[PDB]
Design a protein around this motif. Sequence first.
Motif, short mmCIF file in Angstrom:
data_model
loop_
_atom_site.label_atom_id
_atom_site.label_comp_id
_atom_site.label_asym_id
_atom_site.label_seq_id
_atom_site.Cartn_x
_atom_site.Cartn_y
_atom_site.Cartn_z
N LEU A 1 0.69 -1.17 -0.10
CA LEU A 1 -0.05 -0.07 0.01
C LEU A 1 0.88 1.16 0.07
N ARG A 2 1.76 1.36 0.94
CA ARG A 2 2.61 2.59 1.03
C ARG A 2 3.56 2.68 -0.34
N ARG A 3 3.75 1.47 -0.83
CA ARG A 3 5.09 1.73 -1.84
C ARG A 3 4.05 2.01 -3.14
N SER A 4 2.73 1.78 -3.20
CA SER A 4 1.88 2.26 -4.35
C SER A 4 1.67 3.66 -3.99
N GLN A 5 1.14 4.38 -2.81
CA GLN A 5 0.95 5.58 -2.63
C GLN A 5 2.27 6.36 -3.02
N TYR A 6 3.39 5.76 -2.75
CA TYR A 6 4.69 6.39 -2.88
C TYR A 6 4.95 6.55 -4.40
N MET A 7 4.82 5.64 -5.28
CA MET A 7 5.13 5.78 -6.35
C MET A 7 4.21 6.58 -7.00
N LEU A 8 2.84 6.63 -6.65
CA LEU A 8 2.02 7.62 -7.44
C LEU A 8 2.20 9.09 -6.96
N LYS A 9 2.91 9.50 -5.81
CA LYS A 9 3.58 10.68 -5.54
C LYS A 9 4.49 11.13 -6.46
N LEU A 10 5.58 10.19 -6.74
CA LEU A 10 6.93 10.57 -7.53
C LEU A 10 6.17 10.37 -8.77
N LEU A 11 5.52 9.59 -9.28
CA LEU A 11 5.13 9.51 -10.97
C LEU A 11 4.16 10.52 -11.20
N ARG A 12 3.21 10.77 -10.53
CA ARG A 12 1.93 11.41 -10.95
C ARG A 12 1.53 12.58 -10.15
N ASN A 13 2.61 12.93 -9.20
CA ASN A 13 2.28 14.01 -8.07
C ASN A 13 0.92 13.89 -7.45
N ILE A 14 0.32 12.81 -7.28
CA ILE A 14 -0.81 12.64 -6.57
C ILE A 14 -0.38 11.84 -5.17
N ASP A 15 -1.14 12.49 -3.92
CA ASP A 15 -0.72 12.16 -2.78
C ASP A 15 -2.09 11.59 -2.14
N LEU A 16 -2.03 10.20 -2.32
CA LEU A 16 -3.20 9.69 -1.84
C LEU A 16 -3.41 9.34 -0.25
N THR A 17 -2.42 9.67 0.39
CA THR A 17 -2.53 9.52 1.83
C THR A 17 -3.63 11.01 2.66
N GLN A 18 -3.94 11.94 1.48
CA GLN A 18 -4.52 12.80 1.70
C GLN A 18 -6.06 12.59 1.35
N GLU A 19 -6.88 12.70 2.62
CA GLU A 19 -8.37 12.41 2.43
C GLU A 19 -9.04 13.29 1.31
N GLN A 20 -8.52 14.31 1.15
CA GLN A 20 -9.14 15.20 -0.03
C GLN A 20 -8.93 14.50 -1.59
N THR A 21 -7.68 14.29 -1.71
CA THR A 21 -7.42 13.55 -3.07
C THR A 21 -8.15 12.28 -3.31
N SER A 22 -8.19 11.26 -2.24
CA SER A 22 -8.76 10.11 -2.31
C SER A 22 -10.20 10.15 -2.34
N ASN A 23 -10.93 11.05 -1.86
CA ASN A 23 -12.23 11.23 -2.00
C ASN A 23 -12.73 11.77 -3.33
N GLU A 24 -12.00 12.45 -4.08
CA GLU A 24 -12.43 12.78 -5.35
C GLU A 24 -12.14 11.40 -6.38
N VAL A 25 -11.26 10.66 -5.90
CA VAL A 25 -11.28 9.28 -6.83
C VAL A 25 -12.40 8.44 -6.55
#
Length: 174
Positions: free
Chosen positions: A66-90
């Motif tokens: 889980l953390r490795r996937s959230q971390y990759m998406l931070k580096l590669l897509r500039n998206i931080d899914l640990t943030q309630e705001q970002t993840s709710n849009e999804v």
Amino acid sequence: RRFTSTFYELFPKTFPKKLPIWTIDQSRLRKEYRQLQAQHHPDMAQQGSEQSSTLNQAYHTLKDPLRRSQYMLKLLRNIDLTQEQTSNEVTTSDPQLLLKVLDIHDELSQMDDEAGVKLLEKQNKERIQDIEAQLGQCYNDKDYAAAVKLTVELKYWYNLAKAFKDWAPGKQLE
């Protein structure tokens, strides 16, 4: 344009190419993390100025799916899914998933004994393994939109995994 180091860059034996990848050789990463600690002399300064950027954080982030996937998406897509705001849009766009999660929470509270809880927990472990396999395909194919959706989903199953551990018998109903 980034000049700060990534966690992949802190394990150069494990990642000779130094770029974010999903399929990590975990035995090699563990060995390198222990080796780097063995190589640390008390005159040296450690990497990172706060807990979030230490080698310890880097190691535990890449070890866990889980953390490795959230971390990759931070580096590669500039998206931080640990943030309630970002993840709710999804998952706004995905009621069916949210309903399914919530109905599993309800099933859990209806279980009358540990056997029924163990079954739900085995089924959740299987959803987790399938998502990890699906993520390796999305990263291999640069399907970052699909990896975002699966990673938000994976967080719900991690949360249920903890609910199964925290379960105790004998809750009153009404």
